[PDB]
Design a protein around this nucleic acid. Structure first.
Lengths: 179, 107
RNA sequence: UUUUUUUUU
């Protein structure tokens, strides 16, 4: 998770400790942009005011609970299910679920290990076709959240994505079969 | 079968048996039983995933690429038994795709 | 190895 990392960054910036150090000094000690962080605080305040205005509950769970990161990831998939990449089975590089394009992971991404299923935030073209800001996800969650987009009927014939997506489907159906 | 104890015409009989009752093809494939392993692999590709797994494991035990094929079968068919066969592939060759074979189990 | 723009005291 890159998103989780961002959450850690903001949570550390808004921490009492960072205020006891020198906030701006603390930002200039941890290689962070103060302008971006304060702008983020502002935007967050605005969005919070709007959520309170249109009556959306501010809810959270304990870090002790193992379903914390999972909840966050799921909520991420709720809005970014159309932007999902799958690593080539037994090869190099990734490929997008949407429009089926060959892609790679941006060098600034935290994930050092090969997670075969990822949700991304930005699509960027430079030296190569790069995917920026990602977070590992389970295909099960994707099927659960957006069944409308992840019905097998929607996607082109037997390609790397569909081949193991259908395996995940076989899995799901076996799970249902055993109950 | 009454016509003869066994040569090509019997293969034609097995061919008609395969072209159209899966047992009718599997029996002829049994009497026919590396090219046979390839045709049997095509039969597994047609898919009784368990029986096909038996045909494949027999094809390997008769190979690391074949172990990759059985790992693909684990990726398709079906988990602890897959971990056991993966243990067999691991003992057979402790070398770097084995972690991917473990990945099918994915506690 | 590769962030153009903007996103309410």
């Amino acid at each position: 998770g890159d998103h989780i990392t961002l959450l850690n960054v903001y949570h550390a910036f808004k921490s009492d400790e960072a205020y006891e150090y020198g906030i701006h000094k603390w930002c200039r000690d941890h290689y962070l942009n103060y302008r971006s962080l304060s702008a983020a605080d502002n935007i967050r305040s605005q969005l919070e005011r709007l959520m309170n205005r249109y009556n959306l509950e501010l809810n959270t769970t304990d870090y002790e609970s193992p379903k914390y990161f999972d909840n966050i990831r799921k909520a991420l998939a709720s809005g970014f299910f159309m932007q999902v990449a799958k690593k080539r089975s037994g090869a190099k590089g990734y490929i997008t679920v949407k429009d089926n394009q060959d892609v790679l992971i941006h060098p600034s991404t935290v994930l050092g290990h090969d997670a075969e299923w990822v949700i991304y935030n930005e699509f960027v073209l430079t030296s190569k076709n790069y995917i920026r800001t990602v977070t590992s996800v389970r295909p099960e969650w994707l099927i659960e959240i957006a069944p409308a987009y992840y019905d097998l009927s929607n996607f082109q014939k037997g390609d790397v994505k569909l081949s193991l997506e259908r395996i995940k489907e076989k899995v799901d159906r076996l799970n249902e079969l055993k109950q | 079968y009454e016509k003869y104890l066994p040569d090509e015409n019997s293969g034609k009989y097995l061919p008609s048996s395969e072209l159209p009752e899966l047992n009718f093809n599997y029996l002829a494939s049994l009497e026919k039983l590396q090219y046979e392993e390839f045709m049997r692999q095509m039969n597994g590709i047609y898919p009784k995933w368990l029986f096909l797994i038996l045909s494949l494991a027999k094809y390997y035990i008769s190979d690391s690429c074949g172990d990759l094929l059985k790992k693909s079968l684990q990726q398709t068919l079906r988990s602890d038994f897959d971990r056991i066969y993966n243990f067999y592939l691991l003992f057979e060759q402790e070398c770097q795709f084995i972690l991917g074979k473990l990945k099918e189990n994915d506690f």
